[PDB]
Amino acid sequence: DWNPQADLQAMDRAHRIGQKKQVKVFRLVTDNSVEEKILERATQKLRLDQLVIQQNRTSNPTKRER
Amino acid sequence: SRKESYAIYVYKVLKQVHPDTGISSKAMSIMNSFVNDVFERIAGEASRLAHYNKRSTITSREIQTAVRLLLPGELAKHAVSEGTKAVTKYTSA
């Protein structure tokens, strides 16, 4: 999805309080595809945001019919 | 005085399709009348056409386009090619 935090929002469905097993995420990305750019753009929107959040918490012709 | 019409240019074309067919004056008046109209009908719209795009000089494209506005379908495809050929023949020499 073109929204990484929504991707983050969705993934943690099973990884919360009460999860008694290891959460094993398997994202499907198509090789040699445009999906490669979305994820890179998804990373682009991710890192423009994570960098500051981490600082915040720390500080035809002639064919007539007729 | 001298008043002009199209019958002579008609009559060569007549002889181009029917080289041995006559035509009455009542008919010849009809063609002179007929051709004058068909000129006029397109002539206006293409003029209008220029106004529509705020452009200020009539070209063959507008004529081309204007013909597409009037003539039905298959015939339009014919003449537009013939319009295409002649200018190409004209522009080439």
GROMACS .gro file of N, CA and C in nm:
model
  477
    1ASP      N    1   0.084  -0.119   0.000
    1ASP     CA    2   0.000   0.000   0.000
    1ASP      C    3   0.087   0.124   0.000
    2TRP      N    4   0.037   0.230  -0.063
    2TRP     CA    5   0.109   0.357  -0.073
    2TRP      C    6   0.116   0.431   0.061
    3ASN      N    7   0.074   0.367   0.170
    3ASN     CA    8   0.077   0.425   0.305
    3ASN      C    9   0.155   0.334   0.399
    4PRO      N   10   0.284   0.361   0.424
    4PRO     CA   11   0.363   0.269   0.506
    4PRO      C   12   0.315   0.257   0.650
    5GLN      N   13   0.270   0.366   0.711
    5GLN     CA   14   0.222   0.357   0.849
    5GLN      C   15   0.094   0.274   0.857
    6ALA      N   16   0.011   0.280   0.753
    6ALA     CA   17  -0.099   0.186   0.742
    6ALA      C   18  -0.047   0.043   0.727
    7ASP      N   19   0.059   0.025   0.649
    7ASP     CA   20   0.124  -0.105   0.642
    7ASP      C   21   0.173  -0.147   0.780
    8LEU      N   22   0.234  -0.054   0.853
    8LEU     CA   23   0.270  -0.078   0.992
    8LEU      C   24   0.145  -0.101   1.077
    9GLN      N   25   0.041  -0.021   1.054
    9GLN     CA   26  -0.084  -0.037   1.128
    9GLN      C   27  -0.141  -0.177   1.109
   10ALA      N   28  -0.137  -0.228   0.986
   10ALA     CA   29  -0.198  -0.357   0.957
   10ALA      C   30  -0.116  -0.472   1.014
   11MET      N   31   0.017  -0.465   1.001
   11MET     CA   32   0.101  -0.578   1.037
   11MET      C   33   0.088  -0.615   1.184
   12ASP      N   34   0.079  -0.515   1.271
   12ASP     CA   35   0.079  -0.541   1.414
   12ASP      C   36  -0.054  -0.592   1.465
   13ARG      N   37  -0.138  -0.645   1.376
   13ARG     CA   38  -0.267  -0.699   1.419
   13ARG      C   39  -0.248  -0.813   1.518
   14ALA      N   40  -0.161  -0.908   1.485
   14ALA     CA   41  -0.136  -1.022   1.572
   14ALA      C   42  -0.024  -0.998   1.673
   15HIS      N   43   0.062  -0.899   1.649
   15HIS     CA   44   0.176  -0.872   1.738
   15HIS      C   45   0.141  -0.763   1.839
   16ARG      N   46   0.065  -0.803   1.940
   16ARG     CA   47   0.023  -0.710   2.045
   16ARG      C   48   0.041  -0.780   2.180
   17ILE      N   49  -0.017  -0.721   2.284
   17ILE     CA   50  -0.026  -0.791   2.412
   17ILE      C   51  -0.120  -0.910   2.396
   18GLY      N   52  -0.073  -1.028   2.437
   18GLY     CA   53  -0.147  -1.151   2.420
   18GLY      C   54  -0.097  -1.240   2.309
   19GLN      N   55   0.006  -1.199   2.235
   19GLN     CA   56   0.064  -1.281   2.129
   19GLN      C   57   0.166  -1.375   2.191
   20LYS      N   58   0.139  -1.505   2.185
   20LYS     CA   59   0.224  -1.604   2.250
   20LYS      C   60   0.319  -1.674   2.153
   21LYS      N   61   0.327  -1.630   2.028
   21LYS     CA   62   0.418  -1.688   1.931
   21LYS      C   63   0.496  -1.578   1.859
   22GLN      N   64   0.594  -1.621   1.780
   22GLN     CA   65   0.677  -1.529   1.703
   22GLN      C   66   0.604  -1.485   1.577
   23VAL      N   67   0.591  -1.353   1.560
   23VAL     CA   68   0.521  -1.298   1.444
   23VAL      C   69   0.615  -1.299   1.325
   24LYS      N   70   0.576  -1.371   1.220
   24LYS     CA   71   0.661  -1.399   1.105
   24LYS      C   72   0.595  -1.334   0.984
   25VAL      N   73   0.640  -1.215   0.947
   25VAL     CA   74   0.577  -1.137   0.841
   25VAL      C   75   0.637  -1.178   0.707
   26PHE      N   76   0.550  -1.199   0.608
   26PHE     CA   77   0.591  -1.238   0.472
   26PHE      C   78   0.522  -1.144   0.373
   27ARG      N   79   0.587  -1.031   0.344
   27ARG     CA   80   0.535  -0.938   0.246
   27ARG      C   81   0.563  -0.989   0.105
   28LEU      N   82   0.465  -0.974   0.017
   28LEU     CA   83   0.477  -1.017  -0.121
   28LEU      C   84   0.504  -0.896  -0.209
   29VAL      N   85   0.621  -0.895  -0.273
   29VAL     CA   86   0.659  -0.788  -0.364
   29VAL      C   87   0.701  -0.850  -0.496
   30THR      N   88   0.647  -0.798  -0.606
   30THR     CA   89   0.670  -0.858  -0.736
   30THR      C   90   0.803  -0.812  -0.794
   31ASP      N   91   0.885  -0.908  -0.836
   31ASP     CA   92   1.016  -0.877  -0.892
   31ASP      C   93   1.001  -0.820  -1.033
   32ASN      N   94   1.094  -0.730  -1.068
   32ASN     CA   95   1.095  -0.664  -1.199
   32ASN      C   96   0.961  -0.597  -1.229
   33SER      N   97   0.906  -0.530  -1.128
   33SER     CA   98   0.772  -0.473  -1.138
   33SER      C   99   0.773  -0.329  -1.089
   34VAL      N  100   0.662  -0.261  -1.117
   34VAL     CA  101   0.639  -0.128  -1.064
   34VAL      C  102   0.622  -0.130  -0.913
   35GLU      N  103   0.586  -0.245  -0.856
   35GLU     CA  104   0.574  -0.255  -0.711
   35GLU      C  105   0.706  -0.226  -0.643
   36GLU      N  106   0.817  -0.245  -0.714
   36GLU     CA  107   0.948  -0.212  -0.660
   36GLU      C  108   0.957  -0.063  -0.628
   37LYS      N  109   0.907   0.022  -0.718
   37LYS     CA  110   0.914   0.166  -0.696
   37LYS      C  111   0.824   0.211  -0.582
   38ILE      N  112   0.705   0.152  -0.570
   38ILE     CA  113   0.614   0.190  -0.461
   38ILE      C  114   0.680   0.166  -0.326
   39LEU      N  115   0.741   0.048  -0.309
   39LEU     CA  116   0.808   0.017  -0.183
   39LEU      C  117   0.924   0.112  -0.158
   40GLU      N  118   1.000   0.145  -0.262
   40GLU     CA  119   1.105   0.245  -0.248
   40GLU      C  120   1.046   0.381  -0.214
   41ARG      N  121   0.937   0.418  -0.281
   41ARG     CA  122   0.865   0.538  -0.241
   41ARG      C  123   0.802   0.522  -0.103
   42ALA      N  124   0.754   0.402  -0.071
   42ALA     CA  125   0.706   0.375   0.064
   42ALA      C  126   0.816   0.397   0.165
   43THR      N  127   0.937   0.351   0.134
   43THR     CA  128   1.052   0.380   0.219
   43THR      C  129   1.080   0.530   0.223
   44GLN      N  130   1.064   0.598   0.109
   44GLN     CA  131   1.090   0.741   0.104
   44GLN      C  132   1.000   0.816   0.202
   45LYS      N  133   0.870   0.787   0.199
   45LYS     CA  134   0.779   0.847   0.296
   45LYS      C  135   0.804   0.794   0.437
   46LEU      N  136   0.861   0.674   0.449
   46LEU     CA  137   0.893   0.620   0.581
   46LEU      C  138   1.007   0.697   0.647
   47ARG      N  139   1.118   0.715   0.575
   47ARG     CA  140   1.237   0.775   0.634
   47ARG      C  141   1.227   0.926   0.651
   48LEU      N  142   1.149   0.994   0.567
   48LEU     CA  143   1.124   1.135   0.592
   48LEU      C  144   1.048   1.156   0.722
   49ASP      N  145   0.986   1.051   0.776
   49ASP     CA  146   0.907   1.059   0.898
   49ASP      C  147   0.976   0.996   1.019
   50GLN      N  148   1.039   0.879   1.003
   50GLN     CA  149   1.102   0.812   1.117
   50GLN      C  150   1.219   0.891   1.174
   51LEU      N  151   1.291   0.964   1.089
   51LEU     CA  152   1.409   1.036   1.136
   51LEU      C  153   1.373   1.141   1.241
   52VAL      N  154   1.262   1.212   1.221
   52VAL     CA  155   1.225   1.316   1.316
   52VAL      C  156   1.153   1.258   1.438
   53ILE      N  157   1.076   1.150   1.421
   53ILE     CA  158   1.006   1.088   1.533
   53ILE      C  159   1.105   1.033   1.634
   54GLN      N  160   1.216   0.976   1.585
   54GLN     CA  161   1.319   0.925   1.675
   54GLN      C  162   1.389   1.037   1.751
   55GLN      N  163   1.400   1.156   1.691
   55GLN     CA  164   1.453   1.271   1.763
   55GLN      C  165   1.351   1.328   1.861
   56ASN      N  166   1.222   1.315   1.831
   56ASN     CA  167   1.119   1.368   1.921
   56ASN      C  168   1.119   1.299   2.056
   57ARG      N  169   1.126   1.166   2.058
   57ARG     CA  170   1.121   1.096   2.186
   57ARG      C  171   1.248   1.120   2.267
   58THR      N  172   1.364   1.113   2.201
   58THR     CA  173   1.490   1.127   2.271
   58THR      C  174   1.508   1.267   2.327
   59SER      N  175   1.477   1.369   2.247
   59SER     CA  176   1.484   1.508   2.291
   59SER      C  177   1.407   1.597   2.196
   60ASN      N  178  -1.003   0.256  -4.760
   60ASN     CA  179  -1.091   0.368  -4.727
   60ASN      C  180  -1.122   0.460  -4.847
   61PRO      N  181  -1.020   0.510  -4.919
   61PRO     CA  182  -1.049   0.593  -5.036
   61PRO      C  183  -1.091   0.508  -5.155
   62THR      N  184  -1.168   0.570  -5.245
   62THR     CA  185  -1.220   0.503  -5.365
   62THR      C  186  -1.302   0.379  -5.330
   63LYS      N  187  -1.381   0.387  -5.223
   63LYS     CA  188  -1.459   0.274  -5.171
   63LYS      C  189  -1.597   0.320  -5.128
   64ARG      N  190  -1.663   0.394  -5.216
   64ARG     CA  191  -1.793   0.453  -5.187
   64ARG      C  192  -1.900   0.345  -5.174
   65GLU      N  193  -1.983   0.355  -5.070
   65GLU     CA  194  -2.086   0.255  -5.051
   65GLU      C  195  -2.193   0.263  -5.160
   66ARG      N  196  -2.250   0.381  -5.180
   66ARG     CA  197  -2.370   0.397  -5.262
   66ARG      C  198  -2.475   0.290  -5.235
   67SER      N  199  -2.281   4.374  -6.786
   67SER     CA  200  -2.149   4.353  -6.727
   67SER      C  201  -2.118   4.204  -6.712
   68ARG      N  202  -2.010   4.174  -6.641
   68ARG     CA  203  -1.957   4.038  -6.635
   68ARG      C  204  -1.984   3.978  -6.497
   69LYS      N  205  -2.071   3.877  -6.491
   69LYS     CA  206  -2.102   3.804  -6.368
   69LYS      C  207  -2.057   3.659  -6.380
   70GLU      N  208  -1.996   3.606  -6.275
   70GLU     CA  209  -1.922   3.481  -6.282
   70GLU      C  210  -1.992   3.369  -6.207
   71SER      N  211  -1.963   3.247  -6.253
   71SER     CA  212  -2.025   3.126  -6.202
   71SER      C  213  -1.925   3.012  -6.219
   72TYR      N  214  -1.975   2.889  -6.216
   72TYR     CA  215  -1.888   2.773  -6.203
   72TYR      C  216  -1.911   2.668  -6.312
   73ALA      N  217  -2.001   2.696  -6.406
   73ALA     CA  218  -2.049   2.592  -6.497
   73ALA      C  219  -1.937   2.535  -6.581
   74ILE      N  220  -1.842   2.620  -6.620
   74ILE     CA  221  -1.732   2.572  -6.702
   74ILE      C  222  -1.650   2.468  -6.626
   75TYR      N  223  -1.613   2.499  -6.501
   75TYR     CA  224  -1.542   2.402  -6.419
   75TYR      C  225  -1.627   2.280  -6.394
   76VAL      N  226  -1.758   2.299  -6.386
   76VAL     CA  227  -1.848   2.185  -6.384
   76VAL      C  228  -1.829   2.102  -6.509
   77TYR      N  229  -1.823   2.167  -6.624
   77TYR     CA  230  -1.839   2.092  -6.747
   77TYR      C  231  -1.713   2.012  -6.780
   78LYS      N  232  -1.595   2.061  -6.739
   78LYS     CA  233  -1.477   1.975  -6.751
   78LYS      C  234  -1.494   1.850  -6.667
   79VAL      N  235  -1.538   1.867  -6.543
   79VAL     CA  236  -1.557   1.753  -6.454
   79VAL      C  237  -1.661   1.658  -6.510
   80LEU      N  238  -1.770   1.714  -6.563
   80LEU     CA  239  -1.868   1.631  -6.633
   80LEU      C  240  -1.801   1.544  -6.736
   81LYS      N  241  -1.718   1.605  -6.820
   81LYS     CA  242  -1.646   1.531  -6.923
   81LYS      C  243  -1.539   1.441  -6.864
   82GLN      N  244  -1.504   1.460  -6.736
   82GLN     CA  245  -1.412   1.368  -6.670
   82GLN      C  246  -1.482   1.239  -6.628
   83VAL      N  247  -1.608   1.248  -6.588
   83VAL     CA  248  -1.685   1.129  -6.553
   83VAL      C  249  -1.771   1.084  -6.671
   84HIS      N  250  -1.848   1.175  -6.728
   84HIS     CA  251  -1.924   1.143  -6.848
   84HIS      C  252  -1.879   1.231  -6.962
   85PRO      N  253  -1.784   1.184  -7.044
   85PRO     CA  254  -1.732   1.266  -7.153
   85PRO      C  255  -1.830   1.287  -7.267
   86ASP      N  256  -1.945   1.222  -7.266
   86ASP     CA  257  -2.041   1.236  -7.375
   86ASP      C  258  -2.183   1.248  -7.321
   87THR      N  259  -2.200   1.328  -7.216
   87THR     CA  260  -2.331   1.350  -7.157
   87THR      C  261  -2.357   1.500  -7.152
   88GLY      N  262  -2.475   1.541  -7.197
   88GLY     CA  263  -2.514   1.680  -7.193
   88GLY      C  264  -2.577   1.715  -7.059
   89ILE      N  265  -2.607   1.843  -7.044
   89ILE     CA  266  -2.667   1.896  -6.921
   89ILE      C  267  -2.750   2.018  -6.958
   90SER      N  268  -2.869   2.025  -6.901
   90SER     CA  269  -2.958   2.136  -6.931
   90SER      C  270  -2.919   2.260  -6.851
   91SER      N  271  -2.962   2.376  -6.900
   91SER     CA  272  -2.936   2.500  -6.830
   91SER      C  273  -3.010   2.505  -6.697
   92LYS      N  274  -3.134   2.457  -6.696
   92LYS     CA  275  -3.206   2.445  -6.570
   92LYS      C  276  -3.126   2.362  -6.472
   93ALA      N  277  -3.062   2.256  -6.521
   93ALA     CA  278  -2.969   2.182  -6.438
   93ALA      C  279  -2.846   2.265  -6.405
   94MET      N  280  -2.790   2.336  -6.504
   94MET     CA  281  -2.665   2.408  -6.480
   94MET      C  282  -2.683   2.517  -6.377
   95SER      N  283  -2.796   2.587  -6.382
   95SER     CA  284  -2.829   2.679  -6.275
   95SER      C  285  -2.833   2.606  -6.141
   96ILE      N  286  -2.888   2.484  -6.139
   96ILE     CA  287  -2.899   2.410  -6.013
   96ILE      C  288  -2.761   2.384  -5.955
   97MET      N  289  -2.667   2.340  -6.039
   97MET     CA  290  -2.532   2.316  -5.989
   97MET      C  291  -2.466   2.443  -5.940
   98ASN      N  292  -2.480   2.552  -6.015
   98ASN     CA  293  -2.424   2.679  -5.971
   98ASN      C  294  -2.480   2.716  -5.835
   99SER      N  295  -2.611   2.702  -5.818
   99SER     CA  296  -2.672   2.723  -5.688
   99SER      C  297  -2.619   2.624  -5.586
  100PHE      N  298  -2.610   2.497  -5.624
  100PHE     CA  299  -2.572   2.393  -5.529
  100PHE      C  300  -2.431   2.414  -5.478
  101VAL      N  301  -2.337   2.438  -5.569
  101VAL     CA  302  -2.198   2.454  -5.529
  101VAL      C  303  -2.182   2.575  -5.439
  102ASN      N  304  -2.255   2.682  -5.469
  102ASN     CA  305  -2.242   2.803  -5.390
  102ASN      C  306  -2.278   2.777  -5.245
  103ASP      N  307  -2.384   2.699  -5.224
  103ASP     CA  308  -2.423   2.661  -5.089
  103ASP      C  309  -2.312   2.587  -5.017
  104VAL      N  310  -2.262   2.481  -5.079
  104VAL     CA  311  -2.173   2.391  -5.008
  104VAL      C  312  -2.048   2.466  -4.966
  105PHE      N  313  -2.000   2.554  -5.053
  105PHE     CA  314  -1.900   2.650  -5.010
  105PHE      C  315  -1.944   2.720  -4.884
  106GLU      N  316  -2.063   2.779  -4.888
  106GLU     CA  317  -2.103   2.866  -4.779
  106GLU      C  318  -2.113   2.789  -4.649
  107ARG      N  319  -2.173   2.670  -4.652
  107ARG     CA  320  -2.198   2.599  -4.527
  107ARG      C  321  -2.068   2.577  -4.451
  108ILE      N  322  -1.968   2.519  -4.516
  108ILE     CA  323  -1.840   2.502  -4.449
  108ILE      C  324  -1.778   2.637  -4.418
  109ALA      N  325  -1.784   2.728  -4.514
  109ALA     CA  326  -1.709   2.852  -4.503
  109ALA      C  327  -1.740   2.921  -4.372
  110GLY      N  328  -1.866   2.922  -4.333
  110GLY     CA  329  -1.902   2.982  -4.206
  110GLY      C  330  -1.841   2.909  -4.088
  111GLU      N  331  -1.862   2.778  -4.081
  111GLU     CA  332  -1.820   2.707  -3.960
  111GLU      C  333  -1.671   2.720  -3.940
  112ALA      N  334  -1.593   2.697  -4.045
  112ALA     CA  335  -1.450   2.716  -4.032
  112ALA      C  336  -1.418   2.856  -3.984
  113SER      N  337  -1.490   2.955  -4.035
  113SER     CA  338  -1.473   3.089  -3.981
  113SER      C  339  -1.507   3.090  -3.833
  114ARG      N  340  -1.621   3.031  -3.799
  114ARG     CA  341  -1.658   3.017  -3.660
  114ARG      C  342  -1.551   2.940  -3.586
  115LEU      N  343  -1.502   2.833  -3.648
  115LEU     CA  344  -1.403   2.749  -3.583
  115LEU      C  345  -1.287   2.833  -3.534
  116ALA      N  346  -1.237   2.923  -3.619
  116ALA     CA  347  -1.127   3.008  -3.577
  116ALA      C  348  -1.162   3.086  -3.453
  117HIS      N  349  -1.283   3.141  -3.449
  117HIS     CA  350  -1.324   3.214  -3.330
  117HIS      C  351  -1.325   3.124  -3.208
  118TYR      N  352  -1.357   2.996  -3.226
  118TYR     CA  353  -1.374   2.910  -3.110
  118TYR      C  354  -1.243   2.894  -3.033
  119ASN      N  355  -1.132   2.876  -3.103
  119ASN     CA  356  -1.004   2.864  -3.036
  119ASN      C  357  -0.931   2.997  -3.026
  120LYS      N  358  -1.001   3.108  -3.043
  120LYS     CA  359  -0.942   3.241  -3.038
  120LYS      C  360  -0.823   3.255  -3.132
  121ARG      N  361  -0.814   3.169  -3.232
  121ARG     CA  362  -0.710   3.180  -3.332
  121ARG      C  363  -0.754   3.281  -3.437
  122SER      N  364  -0.664   3.314  -3.530
  122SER     CA  365  -0.694   3.430  -3.613
  122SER      C  366  -0.648   3.412  -3.755
  123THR      N  367  -0.660   3.291  -3.809
  123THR     CA  368  -0.624   3.268  -3.949
  123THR      C  369  -0.675   3.131  -3.991
  124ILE      N  370  -0.754   3.126  -4.097
  124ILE     CA  371  -0.814   3.001  -4.141
  124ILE      C  372  -0.711   2.918  -4.216
  125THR      N  373  -0.703   2.790  -4.182
  125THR     CA  374  -0.624   2.696  -4.260
  125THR      C  375  -0.709   2.578  -4.306
  126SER      N  376  -0.642   2.490  -4.380
  126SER     CA  377  -0.703   2.369  -4.433
  126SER      C  378  -0.748   2.274  -4.323
  127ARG      N  379  -0.675   2.268  -4.211
  127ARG     CA  380  -0.717   2.186  -4.099
  127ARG      C  381  -0.859   2.218  -4.057
  128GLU      N  382  -0.888   2.346  -4.040
  128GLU     CA  383  -1.022   2.387  -4.006
  128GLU      C  384  -1.118   2.344  -4.115
  129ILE      N  385  -1.081   2.369  -4.240
  129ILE     CA  386  -1.159   2.317  -4.351
  129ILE      C  387  -1.172   2.168  -4.338
  130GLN      N  388  -1.058   2.101  -4.320
  130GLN     CA  389  -1.059   1.958  -4.296
  130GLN      C  390  -1.156   1.924  -4.184
  131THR      N  391  -1.138   1.990  -4.070
  131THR     CA  392  -1.224   1.961  -3.958
  131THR      C  393  -1.368   1.996  -3.991
  132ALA      N  394  -1.388   2.111  -4.056
  132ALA     CA  395  -1.523   2.154  -4.088
  132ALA      C  396  -1.593   2.053  -4.177
  133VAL      N  397  -1.520   1.999  -4.273
  133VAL     CA  398  -1.578   1.895  -4.358
  133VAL      C  399  -1.622   1.778  -4.272
  134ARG      N  400  -1.538   1.739  -4.177
  134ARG     CA  401  -1.579   1.633  -4.086
  134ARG      C  402  -1.707   1.669  -4.015
  135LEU      N  403  -1.736   1.797  -3.999
  135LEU     CA  404  -1.859   1.833  -3.931
  135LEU      C  405  -1.979   1.805  -4.020
  136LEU      N  406  -1.969   1.836  -4.149
  136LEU     CA  407  -2.085   1.821  -4.237
  136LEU      C  408  -2.095   1.681  -4.294
  137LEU      N  409  -2.000   1.643  -4.377
  137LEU     CA  410  -2.021   1.532  -4.468
  137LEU      C  411  -2.037   1.401  -4.390
  138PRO      N  412  -2.125   1.311  -4.434
  138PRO     CA  413  -2.148   1.187  -4.358
  138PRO      C  414  -2.038   1.084  -4.376
  139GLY      N  415  -1.972   1.047  -4.266
  139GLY     CA  416  -1.899   0.923  -4.257
  139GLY      C  417  -1.809   0.886  -4.373
  140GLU      N  418  -1.852   0.785  -4.450
  140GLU     CA  419  -1.770   0.729  -4.556
  140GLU      C  420  -1.729   0.834  -4.659
  141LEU      N  421  -1.822   0.922  -4.697
  141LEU     CA  422  -1.785   1.026  -4.792
  141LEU      C  423  -1.681   1.120  -4.732
  142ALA      N  424  -1.695   1.151  -4.603
  142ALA     CA  425  -1.598   1.239  -4.540
  142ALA      C  426  -1.458   1.182  -4.552
  143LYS      N  427  -1.446   1.052  -4.526
  143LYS     CA  428  -1.317   0.985  -4.538
  143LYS      C  429  -1.260   0.999  -4.679
  144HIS      N  430  -1.346   0.995  -4.781
  144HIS     CA  431  -1.296   1.011  -4.917
  144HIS      C  432  -1.235   1.148  -4.937
  145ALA      N  433  -1.317   1.252  -4.925
  145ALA     CA  434  -1.275   1.386  -4.963
  145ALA      C  435  -1.158   1.433  -4.878
  146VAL      N  436  -1.159   1.399  -4.749
  146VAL     CA  437  -1.049   1.441  -4.663
  146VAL      C  438  -0.917   1.388  -4.717
  147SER      N  439  -0.915   1.264  -4.765
  147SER     CA  440  -0.797   1.216  -4.834
  147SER      C  441  -0.771   1.299  -4.959
  148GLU      N  442  -0.877   1.330  -5.034
  148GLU     CA  443  -0.860   1.410  -5.154
  148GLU      C  444  -0.817   1.551  -5.119
  149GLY      N  445  -0.875   1.607  -5.014
  149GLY     CA  446  -0.820   1.729  -4.960
  149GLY      C  447  -0.675   1.711  -4.920
  150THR      N  448  -0.644   1.596  -4.860
  150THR     CA  449  -0.507   1.569  -4.819
  150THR      C  450  -0.413   1.560  -4.939
  151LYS      N  451  -0.457   1.490  -5.043
  151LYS     CA  452  -0.373   1.471  -5.161
  151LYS      C  453  -0.340   1.603  -5.229
  152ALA      N  454  -0.442   1.684  -5.255
  152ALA     CA  455  -0.424   1.801  -5.339
  152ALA      C  456  -0.322   1.898  -5.279
  153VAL      N  457  -0.338   1.929  -5.151
  153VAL     CA  458  -0.243   2.018  -5.086
  153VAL      C  459  -0.105   1.955  -5.088
  154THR      N  460  -0.099   1.825  -5.060
  154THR     CA  461   0.026   1.752  -5.073
  154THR      C  462   0.080   1.767  -5.215
  155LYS      N  463  -0.007   1.746  -5.314
  155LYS     CA  464   0.035   1.774  -5.451
  155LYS      C  465   0.066   1.922  -5.469
  156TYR      N  466  -0.015   2.009  -5.411
  156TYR     CA  467   0.017   2.151  -5.418
  156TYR      C  468   0.147   2.182  -5.347
  157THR      N  469   0.161   2.136  -5.223
  157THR     CA  470   0.277   2.177  -5.144
  157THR      C  471   0.405   2.117  -5.199
  158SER      N  472   0.396   1.997  -5.256
  158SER     CA  473   0.514   1.936  -5.315
  158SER      C  474   0.566   2.018  -5.433
  159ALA      N  475   0.477   2.081  -5.509
  159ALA     CA  476   0.517   2.163  -5.622
  159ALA      C  477   0.418   2.277  -5.645
   0.00000   0.00000   0.00000
